[PDB]
Amino acid sequence: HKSEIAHRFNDLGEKHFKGLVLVAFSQYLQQCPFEDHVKLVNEVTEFAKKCAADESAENCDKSLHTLFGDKLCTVATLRATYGELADCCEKQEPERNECFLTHKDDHPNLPKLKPEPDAQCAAFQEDPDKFLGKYLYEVARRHPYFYGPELLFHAEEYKADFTECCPADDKLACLIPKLDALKERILLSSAKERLKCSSFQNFGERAVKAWSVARLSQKFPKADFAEVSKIVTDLTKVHKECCHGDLLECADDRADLAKYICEHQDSISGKLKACCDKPLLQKSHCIAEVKEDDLPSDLPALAADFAEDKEICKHYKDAKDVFLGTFLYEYSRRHPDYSVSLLLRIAKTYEATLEKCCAEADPPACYRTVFDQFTPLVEEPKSLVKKNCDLFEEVGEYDFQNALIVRYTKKAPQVSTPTLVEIGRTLGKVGSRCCKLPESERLPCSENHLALALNRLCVLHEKTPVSEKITKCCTDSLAERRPCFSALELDEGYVPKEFKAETFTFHADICTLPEDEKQIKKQSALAELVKHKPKATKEQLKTVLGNFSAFVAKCCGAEDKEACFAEEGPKLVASSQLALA
Ligand SMILES: [Co+2]
Ligand SMILES: [Co+2]
Ligand SMILES: [Co+2]
Ligand SMILES: [Co+2]
Ligand SMILES: [Co+2]
């Protein structure tokens, strides 16, 4: 007590306190070795215990920021590895931490993490703490904005894959499909929490609260506006702190909110009963990803209050954030069939139909049909989702991914080929995740997951800005980002890329690659086709990539793969310019 450091240490416990302070330090210094962070973890941790014992020991009075920040300025070769971070060390808090966050790196391009079941199981055995703590470090620097408490959860069950399939008979066919499943849920968690951190950075806490109201209202329609307002206030603080690097306060404020949600579960949702009977970290996760509660029979008509009342302009002018807050709570809770972005688009439209109407002579007759200005906003997303699932169901993940790589390469021919491939592929996964779902939960799954995919494209675009069309879609409006991108067409001020034969030249190296890595090189080539002939129809490119695949399939199954690529490759590179006029 009387010390911020000692206090968390006490409540969170050493294991987690360390766990979070390692993740925190990994995210900030992505370049440093694993053992250089352990000693910063152990030096800080030592200080927590020393402060815990004696709360008037030197500098124990200082803030987490000053402590974590002072410890980030004592590391080896900070100027050599991170010349940018050195300058941050000159400034004091909070100026320093903001500077620190500035130089976080969203695409550091480190080796992809490979399941190596021989060694990893062996390292887990000599030191389990080390092998698992090394997994915290690894994902923490590849995802500088991951949800630290949610990582400790992913790191407690990465261990429960090695408690199962380390002593077992088959060391890969027990382990790989679970470490490959962990990875697809890592990539999803990171995306969700990058979109929360991105929302603060570009749009603010008003935007993150509005999103939360919509989402939580949909999940907890039984809860009243005071419960939702409270959980949103609390959940927002949890995310603001996690995104700014206060992973200690983030883990305590999140556990307090779990404690609360669970104490009040009968008033909030009947779905929570399952989540609240579980251990600490399992509780927070089960709540974060919980099924939506059944729509309540006693849901009120909104016509009366939001369209029919004659003193709405008074309600609205007297306190707007509140009245609009209430609207969003009410419309969201009765529309779980809707996407968060769509609900916020509708809230933004409801708002604009009062700002205008309340200046006209008779407002009530102006906003009486406000609700039928929502129908058009609902049709558009529902079309695209049916348009995209009808194509997906017909041609599969690969051909759908290929179709989207052409769509987005035409809208943004200046974005790099890896970025276009990753986004097209990330978007292609959407069809796999949402189209098979009950069509009831199809529009929400599709749009909410397009929001994660587009947000990454924006994160990358901040780092490496190439296109003014992509800037406007990423920065103007959070609600309208997907509609903004959907609306983009081919940039006709684009100069088609000077044809380089080496780009469309394949060799036998590709025949060794796993299926996934083989597609990326083919999809990489597709993007480069669209760049060279932007006007080429999607039907021309699908045919020319077909000719490329056939060509790869054949030569990979030749006695002389090397000679086959040598003879056929050039013939195909030349015939493809003429197929794409
Ligand atoms: Co406490
Ligand atoms: Co900020
Ligand atoms: Co702070
Ligand atoms: Co309705
Ligand atoms: Co990349």
Residue numbers in the entry: 3 to 583
Paper text:
HSA is also capable of binding non-esterified fatty acids (NEFAs),15 hormones and drugs, as well as a variety of other metal ions, including Zn2+, Ca2+, Cd2+, Cu2+, Mg2+, Mn2+ and Ni2+.16,17 Based on spectroscopic studies and affinity measurements, three Co2+-binding sites have been proposed to exist in HSA and other mammalian albumins: (1) the amino terminal Cu- and Ni-binding (ATCUN) motif (also called the N-terminal binding site or NTS). HSA and ESA are composed of 585 and 583 amino acids, respectively, and share 76.1% sequence identity.
The presence of cobalt in the ESA crystals was confirmed by fluorescence spectra with the excitation energy at 12 664 eV (0.979 Å) using HKL-3000, which showed characteristic peaks for cobalt. For ESA, anomalous peaks were observed for each of the five sites in at least three (out of seven) structures. The strength of the anomalous peaks ranged from 3.0 to 6.3 RMSD (3.0–4.7 RMSD in the structure presented). The only cobalt-bound side-chain common to all four structures is His9, proposed to be a ligand in site B. Residues from adjacent protein chains, which could potentially influence binding in the crystal are also indicated. In NEFA-free ESA, additionally Glu251 coordinates in outer-sphere mode, forming a hydrogen bond with one of the Co2+-bound water molecules. Of the sites without histidine engagement, two are formed by a single aspartate (XII and XIV), three are formed by a single glutamate (XIII, XV and XVI), and one is formed by one alanine and one glutamate (XIV). It is worth noting that His109 in ESA (V) is not conserved in HSA, where the corresponding residue is an asparagine. Of eight of these sites involving histidine residues, six are formed by a single histidine (V, VI, VIII, IX, X and XI), one is formed by a single histidine and a single glutamate (VII), and one involves the backbone amide nitrogens of His3 and Ala2 and a glutamate (IV).
